[PDB]
Amino acid sequence: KTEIHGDSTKATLEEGQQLTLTFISTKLDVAVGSCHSLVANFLDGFLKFQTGSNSAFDVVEVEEPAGPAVLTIGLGHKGRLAVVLDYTRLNAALGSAAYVVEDSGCSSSEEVSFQGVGSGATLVVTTLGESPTAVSA
């Protein structure tokens, strides 16, 4: 379990993992290891992700959160991801977005970087049942 009260929190992921990041911000600069890129800019209203959109990333407009934001990405294959994020919106309503992409990026070895979580967010990184302590350290 890697947690940083600074601003960024990195942690290598291993097959069959689960990333539960509870942060209170409108921006999240994510860097999934080195074989994937994903920038969640809720400030403008779009989540740029490079999974399998061919050639490069794909910009998909997202709701306008309002403070708290729960991002839960469960891994369970070569690159299969399940981005299930539930957060509060400016529309005074709950926003539960989901993404299911089998062919995304890596899995076994992938140091994901989460910047913008500020000092108060927790990064729950566990391989289903076991705990991947940096799975490299």
Curated annotation (Swiss-Prot):
It is found in: Cytoplasmic vesicle, Secretory vesicle, Microneme; Host early endosome. GO terms for molecular function: carbohydrate binding; host cell surface binding; sialic acid binding; Toll-like receptor 2 binding; Toll-like receptor 4 binding. GO terms for cellular component: cytoplasmic vesicle; host cell endosome; microneme. Residues 1-137 are annotated as: Galectin-like. Disulfide bonds join C35-C106. The keyword Transmembrane helix does not apply. The keyword Metal-binding does not apply. Keywords: Cell adhesion, Cytoplasmic vesicle, Disulfide bond, Host endosome, Immunity, Lectin, Signal, Virulence. Disruption phenotype: Significantly reduced invasion efficiency. Reduced production of IL12 in host cells during infection. Slightly reduced virulence of parasites in mice. No significant effects on parasite gliding motility. No significant effects on parasite attachment to the host cell prior invasion. One of its GO terms (biological process) is symbiont-mediated perturbation of host receptor-mediated signal transduction. The galectin-like domain has been demonstrated not to bind lactose, glucose, maltose, mannose, heparin, fucose, L-arabinose, N-acetyl-D-galactosamine, or N-acetyl-D-glucosamine. It interacts directly with the second and the third EGF-like domain of MIC6, and with part of the acidic domain. Soluble adhesin with carbohydrate-binding activity. Binds to sialic acid-terminating oligosaccharides. Required for attachment of the parasite to the host cell and subsequent invasion. Ensures correct folding of MIC6 and transport of the MIC6-MIC1-MIC4 complex into the micronemes. Facilitates the correct targeting of MIC4 to the micronemes. Triggers the activation of murine bone marrow-derived dendritic cells and macrophages and production of pro-inflammatory cytokines, such as IL12 (IL12B/IL12A), in host TLR2/TLR4-dependent manner. Monomer. May form homotrimers. Part of the MIC6-MIC1-MIC4 complex. Interacts (via the beta-finger region) directly with MIC4 (via the second apple domain). Interacts directly with MIC6. Interacts with murine TLR2; the interaction promotes activation of bone marrow-derived dendritic cells and macrophages in the host. Interacts with murine TLR4, the interaction promotes activation of bone marrow-derived dendritic cells and macrophages in the host. This is Micronemal protein 1. It comes from Toxoplasma gondii.
